[PDB]
């Protein structure tokens, strides 16, 4: 994320652009993931668990529109 | 409180000057429900203070309040690691309460003979930024600034 300062752009405005650019490239998430080694089994387990719960919540939501709560 | 929704008790103004701040000051100074005793002390102290300063009683009293009012204090936070002193800005109502409390405490822990004379000297020291009351204001401020790192 290489942000060049634009003309007339105040520092706060440029800084917001730079922070969002980094958050878009996902630098901090990448660094946190590479702090410590995790076994391939741990990685696969975590990936599979997120998929299962994400799918379950989507299905739960898509059935919550069916019924009325009051 | 928990189910908060507590409402504020209205306080009548003082008879002689009609100021809610002076009425609260009498209340803070009062001990054991002896309001007549406390009221006499406040009026005597204000009269002598105004003879010294030479301004209106309410004005001179307000010029002492201005130099004791804190602008930031430190609460304690049990979230991060339970060791956090977080500086927080004080609302104006609490500023007046804290200034009055510190003024009264300083006047009590003094060396003069009568309470009226102790109170007048404390108000003068507050009006020239030299008393133990203004000392505690400065002390709280420096503590908040040393914890400014944790302000976030």
């Amino acid at each position: 994320p290489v942000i060049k300062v634009r003309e007339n752009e105040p520092f706060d405005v440029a800084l917001r652009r730079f922070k969002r650019s980094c958050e878009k490239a996902g630098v901090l998430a990448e660094v946190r993931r590479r702090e410590f080694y995790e076994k391939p089994t741990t990685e696969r387990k975590r990936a599979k668990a997120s998929a299962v719960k994400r799918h379950a919540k989507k299905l739960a939501r898509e059935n919550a529109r069916r019924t009325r709560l009051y | 409180p928990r189910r908060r929704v507590i409402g504020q008790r209205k306080i009548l103004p003082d008879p002689k000057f009609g100021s809610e701040l002076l009425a609260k000051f009498v209340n803070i100074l009062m001990v054991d429900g002896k309001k007549s005793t406390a009221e006499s002390i406040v009026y005597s102290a204000l009269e002598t203070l105004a003879q010294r300063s030479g301004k209106s009683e309410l004005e001179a009293f307000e010029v002492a309040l201005e130099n004791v009012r804190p602008t930031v204090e430190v609460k304690s936070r049990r979230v991060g690691g339970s060791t956090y002193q977080v500086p927080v800005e004080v609302r104006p109502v609490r500023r007046n309460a804290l200034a009055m409390r510190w003024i009264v405490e300083a006047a009590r822990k003094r060396g003069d003979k009568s309470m009226a004379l102790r109170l007048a000297n404390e108000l003068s020291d507050a009006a020239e930024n030299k008393g133990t009351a203004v000392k505690k204001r400065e002390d709280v401020h420096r503590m908040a600034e040393a914890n400014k790192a944790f302000a976030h």
């Binding site: 994320p1 290489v2 650019s21 490239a25 | -």
Partner: protein
């Protein structure tokens, strides 16, 4: 999202076309997910291969910072 290779009949993506491939890399230079661009999985694999071949021949940069 609509795949821009299925609608054009493209068989192979080609690593020598540095106009289409520039649309499919980000500013940092990494390949954009197919979930964002709406490309199909078959063309996504072809596209990733083409981008990697272009990087070797220095038609595309590996990252935004080595230059």
């Amino acid at each position: 999202k609509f795949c821009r290779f299925t609608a054009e009949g493209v068989q192979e993506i080609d690593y020598k076309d540095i106009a289409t491939l520039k649309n499919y890399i980000t500013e940092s230079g990494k390949i954009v997910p197919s979930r964002i661009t709406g490309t199909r999985a078959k063309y996504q694999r072809q596209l990733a291969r083409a981008i990697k071949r272009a990087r070797y021949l220095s038609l595309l940069p590996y990252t935004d910072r080595h230059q």
